[PDB]
Homo-oligomer: A and B are copies of this chain.
Amino acid sequence: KFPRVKNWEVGSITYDTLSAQAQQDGPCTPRRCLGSLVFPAPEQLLSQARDFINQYYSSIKRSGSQAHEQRLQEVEAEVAATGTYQLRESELVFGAKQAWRNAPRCVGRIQWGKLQVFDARDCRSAQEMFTYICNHIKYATNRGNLRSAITVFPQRCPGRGDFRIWNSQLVRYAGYRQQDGSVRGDPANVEITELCIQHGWTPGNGRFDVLPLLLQAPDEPPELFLLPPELVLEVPLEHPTLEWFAALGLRWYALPAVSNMLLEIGGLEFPAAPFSGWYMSTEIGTRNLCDPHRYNILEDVAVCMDLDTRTTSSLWKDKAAVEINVAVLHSYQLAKVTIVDHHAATASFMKHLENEQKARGGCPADWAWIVPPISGSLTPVFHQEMVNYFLSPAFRYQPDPW
């Protein structure tokens, strides 16, 4: 009674036994599917914790040992005394990797095991926070040869407030409101931009102005931190065979570093644990630039391409979109900044589902997020059925601290 999953390009069939362990509940019932929605005490902490420890002890093939029982006894004894507990460092490393491994909407998961984990749980202020962050950015960027990294700030704990990073990503561009009621820069970041300003940031007026950090120490207002310019590797965008493209003045940044997600390991919550890998060209090419509610350059590129934008059947949108993606790939290659196209990405994800079926008897996957936003059926994930479910450890969304 495990979901039969087919690959339609090949003919292969597997059953997802791993789904039957899903440690949390989703938005769907047999009445109605909601898969397409973006946003779907002590003893209960003990049962999550006990579950994680079992996981950790399985992965180090010391399952059901002395050190395993002792560790359970340790944890329940500490939840007694303090109403919480502390992860050992190896447990944290494993927990951070599993969280990525379990992230259903991530197409880059072939890499899950190669994650660099920086432990900043000793962190003290917004100031020490800023430094750890700059170091994350420095290590992960690595002069354009990107490394996967995660910095883990102190856990949610009884008595103190949370560390929070107010910014959605470590590097993001300003979005300013206007006289036309419109936005200059990235419309997705108008709110946080408003917040930065009113917290003492002297704004600019470009379309690619990098935002300051708003960092929050427990029980403090947020504190504004300017990123040292030379720490933010950017990539000016140019097209390999369309020379007017460089005159669009478009740029994107090297490091995709998501900074507003919560990391959950064994019932413990880390509201601040920014992570980063490297871009798939489509996030920038199609989503960041061509979404109407974003930079929305599609028509502008299409006109310049001298496509016929009168009628849809000329497929001007598709033609413009493909060139913008080529431009992004080319520019990142010219600059020696790591980048993966959607065909390479989805192909390593197939390898991933295959590694995962042998290893854990399945792989939690969100089809609508895994299939790229152009060339969908041109990639192998489109033809693959997938089971979506929530495993812990995990990254979760959390509400904006403001």
Count residues of A near B (Cβ-Cβ below 8 Å).
68
Q: Report A281-339 residues with CB < 8 Å from chain B CB.
A: 281, 286-287, 290-293, 298, 312-315, 317-319, 321-322, 325-326, 329, 333
**A286 cross-chain contacts in B, Cβ below 8 A:** 377-378
CB-CB nearest in chain B for A381: B36
Q: Are B373 and A377 in contact (CB under 8 A)?
A: yes
Kindly state whether residue A25 has any CB partner on chain B within 8 Å: yes
Q: Are A298 and B31 in contact (CB under 8 A)?
A: no
Q: Are A322 and B312 in contact (CB under 8 A)?
A: no
User: Out of B30, B318, B322, which one reaches A27, CB within 8 Å?
Assistant: B30
Q: Are B38 and A35 in contact (CB under 8 A)?
A: no
Distance (whole angstroms) from the CB of A314 to the closest CB of chain B: 8
Kindly state whether residue A28 has any CB partner on chain B within 8 Å: yes
Query: Which of A20, A318, A371 has most B Cβ within 10 Å?
Result: A318
User: What's the Cα separation between A243 and B357 when bound, in Å?
Assistant: 47
Known contacts A25-B30, A325-B318, A378-B298, A38 near B313 by CB under 8 Å = no
Kindly state whether residue A176 has any CB partner on chain B within 8 Å: no
Q: Are A25 and B19 in contact (CB under 8 A)?
A: no
Query: Which of A16, A26, A371, A377 has most B Cβ within 10 Å?
Result: A377
Copies of this chain in its oligomeric complex:
2
Kindly state whether residue A218 has any CB partner on chain B within 8 Å: no
**A325 cross-chain contacts in B, Cβ below 8 A:** 315, 318
Kindly state whether residue A382 has any CB partner on chain B within 8 Å: yes
Q: Are A367 and B36 in contact (CB under 8 A)?
A: yes
Q: Are B385 and A318 in contact (CB under 8 A)?
A: no
In the complex, per-residue mask of A32-57: 1 if CB is within 8 Å of any chain B CB, else 0: 11111110000000000000000000
User: Out of B5, B315, B329, B376, which one reaches A315, CB within 8 Å?
Assistant: B329
Q: Are A378 and B26 in contact (CB under 8 A)?
A: no
User: What's the Cα separation between A193 and B290 when bound, in Å?
Assistant: 44
Distance (whole angstroms) from the CB of A88 to the closest CB of chain B: 30
**A-B residue pairs in contact (CB < 8 Å), sample of 7:** A28-B29, A29-B29, A32-B388, A33-B387, A35-B367, A290-B378, A312-B344
Given contacts A3-B34, A9-B293, 13 further A-B contacts (CB under 8 A): A3-B37, A8-B38, A9-B291, A20-B31, A32-B389, A33-B387, A33-B388, A35-B388, A313-B333, A315-B322, A321-B375, A374-B374, A374-B377
A residues lining the B interface (CB < 8 Å): 3, 5-6, 8-11, 16, 19-20, 22, 25-38, 281, 286-287, 290-293, 298, 312-315, 317-319, 321-322, 325-326, 329, 333, 341, 343-344, 347, 366-368, 371-378, 382-383, 385-389
